[PDB]
DNA sequence: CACACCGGAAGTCCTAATTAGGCCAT
DNA sequence: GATGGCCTAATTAGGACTTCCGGTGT
């Protein structure tokens, strides 16, 4: 019943101390940065088993979101992205195609 | 059970002219289905052209490669093709 | 209850979220490709199909007797202009 | 030169939609 | 021949990320 995301998994280990030298927020707008990515991202992988994961990887994943507006990045603050909205995200008939105009049968003969 | 339901079958020459045919037949119109969702969900161009065992050739384009099979040039073109020996 | 949605039932319109768009056009792209293949195979027909990505590209496959329609020089040009036509 | 970032493309993973083989009918 | 359809069992995708990277910026 897992479910897990990024984005969550970043507010799991975004609330809890243990990994603080790694994860840290910054401002109180939801802001924050990844001081040690390689290792966030090898906790990453250890879930979703993906052995193989990194920042290269993992950052990817982030800047999806970009677009799909879920996090975005500073300029500049290198490992510093941020929740766009915060704290408000914490909640805590088959032959269609023969009548398409488009479509066309007949015979190789008829081509003269 | 009554029916076996879809049984899985070698990825070869179906040698077996009522088997082939039927298959030919209802995999053209999955495909073709697909072609015409393909275009129609992401609005891009697509143009799928397939010529039965029988001789009927059936074709779906999408409105600017149309021109590939009812052109006179293209509609020659397919005849070139389709009629070079084996 | 399970890891993730699953597939899910999609509306049969043009899809407007460009990423959603842009990845159903690649997930499709590559099958019905898959398809233009097994059907030309298994039955032995001569099959093409040619899909052009809304970025520029040009995907496509043929069986032998069909390759000039995207080999030859008369097709290539052809395809040229389709594609190039006004919208 | 290094290193984060940017993004395009296309490929897992899990599931829940969709196809497509045997067979009989049209 | 070419399809329609049923009964089931194979394959596809949708979503949400992963994998390769060749370009940039700084």
């Known amino acids: ?92 008939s088959r032959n269609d195609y023969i009548h398409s105009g488009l479509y066309s049968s007949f015979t190789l003969n008829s081509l003269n | 059970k009554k029916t076996r339901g879809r049984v899985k079958i070698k990825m070869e020459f179906i040698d077996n002219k009522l088997r082939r045919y039927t298959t030919f037949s209802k995999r053209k119109t999955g495909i073709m289905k697909k072609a015409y969702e393909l275009s129609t969900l992401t609005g891009t161009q697509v143009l799928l052209l397939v010529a039965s065992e029988t001789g009927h050739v059936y074709t779906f384009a999408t409105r600017k490669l149309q021109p590939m099979i009812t052109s006179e040039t293209g509609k020659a073109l397919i005849q070139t093709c389709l009629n070079s020996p084996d």
């Not at chain 1, 507006?69 to 500073?74: A, M, R, S």
């Open chain 1, 1 to 92: 019943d897992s479910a897990i995301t990024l984005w969550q998994f970043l507010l799991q280990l975004l609330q809890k101390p243990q990994n603080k030298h790694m994860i840290c927020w910054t401002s109180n707008d939801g802001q924050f940065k990844l001081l040690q990515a390689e290792e966030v991202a090898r906790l990453w992988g250890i879930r979703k088993n993906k052995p193989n994961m990194n920042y290269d990887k993992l950052s990817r994943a982030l800047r999806y979101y970009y677009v799909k507006n879920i996090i975005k990045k500073v300029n500049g603050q290198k490992f510093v992205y941020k929740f766009v909205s915060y704290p408000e995200i914490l909640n805590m």
